[PDB]
Design a protein around this ligand. Sequence first.
Ligand SMILES: Cc1ncc(COP(=O)(O)O)c(C=O)c1O
Lengths: 300, 296, 297, 294, 300, 306
Amino acid sequence: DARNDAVLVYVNGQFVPRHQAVVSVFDAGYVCGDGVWEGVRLVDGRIVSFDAHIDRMYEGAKSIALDIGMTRAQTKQVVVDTFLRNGMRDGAHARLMVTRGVKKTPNQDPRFIIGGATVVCVAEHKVVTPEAKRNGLKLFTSTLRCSGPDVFDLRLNSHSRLNLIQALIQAIQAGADEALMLDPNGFVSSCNSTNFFAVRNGALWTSSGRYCFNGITRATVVRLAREAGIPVHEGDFTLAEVYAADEAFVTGTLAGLTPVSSVDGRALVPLGPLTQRLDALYRAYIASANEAHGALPAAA
Amino acid sequence: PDARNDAVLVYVNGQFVPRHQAVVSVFDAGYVCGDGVWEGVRLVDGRIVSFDAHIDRMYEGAKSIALDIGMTRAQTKQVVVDTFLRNGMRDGAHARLMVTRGVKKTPNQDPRFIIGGATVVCVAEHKVVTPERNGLKLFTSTLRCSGPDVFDLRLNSHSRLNLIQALIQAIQAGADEALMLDPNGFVSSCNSTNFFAVRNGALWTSSGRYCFNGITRATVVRLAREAGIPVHEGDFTLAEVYAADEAFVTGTLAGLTPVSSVDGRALVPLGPLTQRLDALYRAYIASANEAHGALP
Amino acid sequence: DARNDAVLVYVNGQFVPRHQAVVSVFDAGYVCGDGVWEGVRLVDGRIVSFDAHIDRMYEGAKSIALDIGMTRAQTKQVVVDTFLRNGMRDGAHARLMVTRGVKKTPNQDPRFIIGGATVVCVAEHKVVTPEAKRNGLKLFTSTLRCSGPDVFDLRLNSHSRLNLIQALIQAIQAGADEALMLDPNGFVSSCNSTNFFAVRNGALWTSSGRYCFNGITRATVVRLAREAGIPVHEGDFTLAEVYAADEAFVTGTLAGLTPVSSVDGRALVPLGPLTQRLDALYRAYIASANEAHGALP
Amino acid sequence: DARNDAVLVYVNGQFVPRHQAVVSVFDAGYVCGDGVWEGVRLVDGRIVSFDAHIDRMYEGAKSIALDIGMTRAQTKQVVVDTFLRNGMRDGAHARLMVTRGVKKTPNQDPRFIIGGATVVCVAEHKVVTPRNGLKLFTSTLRCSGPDVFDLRLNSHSRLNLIQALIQAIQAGADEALMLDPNGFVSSCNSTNFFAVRNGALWTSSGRYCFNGITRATVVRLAREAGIPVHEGDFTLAEVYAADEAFVTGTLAGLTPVSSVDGRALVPLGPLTQRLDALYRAYIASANEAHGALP
Amino acid sequence: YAPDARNDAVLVYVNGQFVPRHQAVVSVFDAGYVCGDGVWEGVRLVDGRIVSFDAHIDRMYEGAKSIALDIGMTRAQTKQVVVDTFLRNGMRDGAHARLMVTRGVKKTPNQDPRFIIGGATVVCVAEHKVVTPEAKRNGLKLFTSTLRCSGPDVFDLRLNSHSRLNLIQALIQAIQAGADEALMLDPNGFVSSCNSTNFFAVRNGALWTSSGRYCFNGITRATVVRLAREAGIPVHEGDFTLAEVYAADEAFVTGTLAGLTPVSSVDGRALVPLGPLTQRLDALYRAYIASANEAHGALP
Amino acid sequence: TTSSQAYAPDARNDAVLVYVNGQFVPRHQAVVSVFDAGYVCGDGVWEGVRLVDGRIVSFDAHIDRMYEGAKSIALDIGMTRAQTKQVVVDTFLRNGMRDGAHARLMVTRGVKKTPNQDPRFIIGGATVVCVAEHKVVTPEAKRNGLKLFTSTLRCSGPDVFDLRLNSHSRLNLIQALIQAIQAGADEALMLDPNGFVSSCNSTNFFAVRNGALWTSSGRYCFNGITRATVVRLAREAGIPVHEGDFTLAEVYAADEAFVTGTLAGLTPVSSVDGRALVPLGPLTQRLDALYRAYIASANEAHGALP
Ligand SMILES: Cc1ncc(COP(=O)(O)O)c(C=O)c1O
């Protein structure tokens, strides 16, 4: 989308063209991966599941003693302002990135910070029709594991992403699009950047999320499934259960439900019936005037 | 603390940029994802201490994450040299060379869609660490060093929340630095320095299977063996620490820092073996050893 | 409480003045930490949740093949007699301690015990100060872990307590009052001597208890919560979920619900609304003529 | 030995007849298993490897912030005095037990201690005969890693070991063998474990068990006699196919192992016999490791 | 199983042939013999009905899929193998069959699954096997082996395979402790299963069994759980300890071959065999397997 | 489509006689009861040995591993070591092999009264099978090098399954191989439970970094004869050997890697997880030459054919 060349990026309250959207080399985010972020989608004038995203950011920031320096409402207003300044109402997404701040000297220690969080919001136009993603993802189960929370709590949506990127790198070399990752016990946990679901015998299966990002999209699809009386098995399941699944798909804010066409070269039919049903339910939900979605105000 | 640091010029992608303007894109993999490797080096009496050892670690770490540095070792070395030269630094300085995957078309974790090359940044700063080192308080964090199938701590990367989180806990315990156990509960390392204990005239340190394998650590081990001090490199416990004669940490920035307590258990700071190894280390880094790259 | 100086302690069927209440240096409890115990609270003539305590003791004793050498009723009678001998009817607590017995030689081997189990009951006056009048515990999450049951089953309420004391020692040196402990997987398990609870958005959260003492108080508070329609999250939760909690508190027979004012230096407002509601429910429950509480004669 | 009925036990500086040797029910040792101990053997007027034992006690005490309240010399003197008071010169053993002390109220918290550490020393006669050999069963219960409970500590908290022993006894065995968290052979519940394979001694690294003085002695004697010792990770398979096995501890010395999990080994194999003779010679010698009685 | 002279003369299905017992053979190059490379099911024939037949076939198809083993038959055809093996032997009642499907004959003996001449080897051993209540009622002695159930990233014990040394090893240790069967803990130390049967305990009127994350998910196990819930017996399917076993009121094990077998001790800790809830569930199970339920495949 | 298990096709292999329980049986007729413990349960141990210039390479070492493995699973082989040796010798002799051959000796617990796991139910003694085949693995066939993928499936600790056992229960290894095959690789590399490099699914793994040979401790994999030989040859030639915990990072930055086993000797590795390594680097070539010299010598380790 050619219009992406002319977007303004929010950087510490300045609206800046992409080629000039910059942060100090001393920023905690650049030096140390020291920050938390959220991606949100804008559909028909509404930021999808906005509060759920902001809640995860406030929880993640709290866990790393990172002062966001704004109330929830103010942080929301950053995103709102970024969409308004770009004239975006629909078919957009934004990545809100909050890093500890600019450091007196590049090192890990958070006490060496000049106070004031770095706040960046990258808003962009995008789009993809439901059976145009007809291209299922190929998944490869990486040898690199999800961590337990005494090592690194994967509920944290952080700027420290090498633990996930490394699994993706391995999956790419296996000819896959995305890594599936096991938890420390060997049960299926999640993909490197999306949550993983299987369909077995009319039932929806996904991990407990004890060892992966608990995506807002994952949460929404679970809820939609239960509300529709689809049985949901949220708990420990294996690669054997995946290879024998009827369908599989991944979830995340950027693409919604993406069908999976194979796992470790084991074929699954992309876009099976239950994927189709849940996708329709999700598409309806994100387009509705549901109170979970924050209506973008008109400009002043 | 040194007023000259306010005016240093930072290497960014071949340009020397004043401190307050030295910037990287918000789309850079280092900012978005902590996706990069770095090395810190110390400049002593015109010589970059253990320069090659630092560069080899960077090349191996970059290789591990399929990050093309986009430079030969000689070129990379030249970046650091040039950064010191541009700042008129000959002694009492430290530099952090940071290499991140590069500028992405869109901010996300996927390494594939990189416009252009690796981002290369070098921050040099005057950093005199006086021996006048009252000894660190350590607290053993509840947060663990990972095994290499989760996150290989030999990597010196821009993804450091795994270490920072241990440090945060130690800070709230009233300590200066976190000590970290490995997945089996043996002593591994500190959050930003390697850890050593002294027991009965012997030097003890972890195997390094689960922590950064620091250059300083390696140097101190080597000096110890060359001086006929016994070195136990292997699994040891909190109990062995609490009953030690001495303890100290190692890193490029500070050299040997004495430890005055671990989990509130007092140790006499700067014991005899710490003092000897410190003298050996200061001698070594100030010598015309072939391990150190002379500035022009 | 000055009265505590003069209490009589039950020792093997005798009432013994406190300063003379003694056990052989050959006792399995002393040599080896080899025994199980229960703490019970006496409130308004009633031993709180007495049966629940006794059932834990019988299960724990069974797990280490320790024959208590008494029926459940008889064991209860020890505690009853200990309170009655000391003229206690309210405001008291007792520790019933049952160790394997006197050994022919001091070593770990449980065989070759002279006689039966050693039975000791220490009753003492404690005023439990009102809810409003304590400003909350500081917790530090120790580096020392709760064990899995193939290493040491923390459901066991035993005389072998260095595994818990070690975590407490570390927490004390961090400036805290009590240790929080993670399980082998890194999820929150319990404190070193009390069970741990968090409140997150009007909901009560506590571990599954797979890796800690399953306290009677814990079990009571879970049940009270559900009976009151407070949602209860019993399952795996993290330090992150604690640091972002609205409230936290710990449970045990000695103090009831004790509010938590911080965890690893992260402030929590002590005695938040859900702590206060559950405390009122618990204080009501332990003072009621519920059938779970054994009336003194 | 009938003489054991009349021994005097050291309790806090007093020598107390056996049947009156007592500790408060408020003692940290009784309430909580909160203390450290050492077993020592007296051979031909010498306390075997005395300093080594005391050093482990001081290290263990330090790990649990237990103040013994005595210098090393004083602690040694308690044991010396206990043997002297009982007229023991040979064929005796003592257990020195140091618990945190008397509590104001029975609970786990180490802070509320009236006075100093409780110090108890039980000395007893035992003749150690020149012996059927132990049956060992590998318990399902594991040695812990040091972030759960460090088995180098020789403490009064012993149910973690007793539980393994209980399972072994019900399997018809005399002693539990115990694996480490990774499934490698670690130790027995109360003695260190050795296997003999191909002229070589095999024992665990000791990362996950008590580091016994006897174990250390046997390793050294083996190397001085040119028997190699492989201290490392080894498996049940390597035990079941061993030529011999034995256990070590202060109480019995080298005890042969005659089976593990029902798999027969030699009732007393040649290298066990050699090392036992070397050990008996060593503990009877005027070595500087042994503290001569007055 | 009660001694039965008729078993000496049974015909075994081998690759479409009915072969007398003493001649029923497979190539030394077969993947099953060289490598334990195959999946199997045991089924019980009661009053002309193969008990829970589809459930067994479903497990076989999932297990074969997990190891990329093509059974080379439709489910109907697979069923017909079993049917034919019972019919050929004139069995209508009081019989059991083991259906074994191995990857096939190899070009050379090695582990590599690619080197297969021809299709899967299919063997069906049917035998008269009444396990009398006389024989069963007194109960098994269990010993908790030191050898543990694996997590699914090492070996998924839901697989019913020809690679059984991981189970046999536990059993060998139990046999030498004077026990009949090994009980096995999972990697975390919780009770998982026996070496060849699923394990249940009864505590205070409630049925306890493991979650099955670390053991074979037996058909009989699943049937007993369902009968318990249908009878309003509480079921605690979850993590429990040896302490909870040693203090249980009753214990029993389940499997196709013997049904519910009472446990008389675990690690030498006595349990009264055939307690009231074991007897109730046993009565419910015997009723169920003898009924015209649609889960059971009627012989023609 | 590549194995580390491939060798020159050899028409003579159609007609070999297989030892089965004391008989020599034509290949197509060489059979075992469907009640055999090996078929039902994977219940047996095996050894593969290579015949070079009339000498069975490292024969005693193979036999010792078999006897130890059989002991570990209480399997009575029912033959002395000399008898067992003689079975393999006789199998090579009966097929006229003196060179360029490999045998797999398979000993399973025996015929069961009923197919189940219980080892008590055994009629008679152990089943003994020996399959000898002409198997030349040329250096030409090897020069391309194997592609490794690090499987998600891991080597077990010995309290789950002791990988020093060379058993008929091989789905634990085959599963890792299946995953590697679908990644486009020839063989699976496997990590140990701690995440350190352990072994391949059917061969031992080595890396070369800076003139030094690196291989795992072997605490968590088959302790191959070939592996042990290569370690000793390296030490004897003064090449430093790092036997201990190393990582995927250490592999991806290696100068060379190769795998070892009886069937192929030293096979160079060309990539691990898509990370290229030059196949047949200088230290692989030196160790290969040392190994070929060693297996062709009259070393005391090799069993002379009569
Ligand atoms: C699993 C495994 N790895 C590697 C090898 C290679 O070892 P060797 O050199 O002894 O054939 C073997 C031998 O069978 C093996 O079984």
